[PDB]
Design a protein around this ligand. Sequence first.
Ligand SMILES: [Mg+2]
Ligand SMILES: [Mg+2]
Length: 163
Amino acid sequence: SNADLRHIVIDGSNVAMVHGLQHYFSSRGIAIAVQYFWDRGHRDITVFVPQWAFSKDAKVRESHFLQKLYSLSLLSLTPSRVMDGKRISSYDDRFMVKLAEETDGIIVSNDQFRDLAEESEKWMAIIRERLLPFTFVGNLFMVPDDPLGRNGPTLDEFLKKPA
RNA sequence: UUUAU
Ligand SMILES: [Mg+2]
Ligand SMILES: [Mg+2]
């Protein structure tokens, strides 16, 4: 938009699960979230999902949305593997906070990241000021005008760098 | 830490 927009880091698992009412990994919800930011002019957007969310064996709903996002250079995969029928995953939350640190971006998630805030002042601060929670109503993605509450910034300010 | 609260 104005080249002062922040990078958007999306917790894909969290978004998909909310869209799927904590039952389905609903890929459509991730595409809807991306479209929301895209429509505001954001062009720096990264969705993290685990490697398993492309595995043939895994139950993911409407997985072709993930393929669309991958091909648009919007999707990155966090490591996971099955050893002795035991799935081991790298903790995806660390990638999100790290990327947010690298980019001065915000994280779209209803996760609170309590465990990672405790780990440094840089990270503690990202988690206090750069976390953007969200709601779905069916296929309508809704984000608060007041992401940090009544005395915090507006959404518009929140999604920009002081330029 | 097979996504959260
Ligand atoms: Mg997570
Ligand atoms: Mg977490």
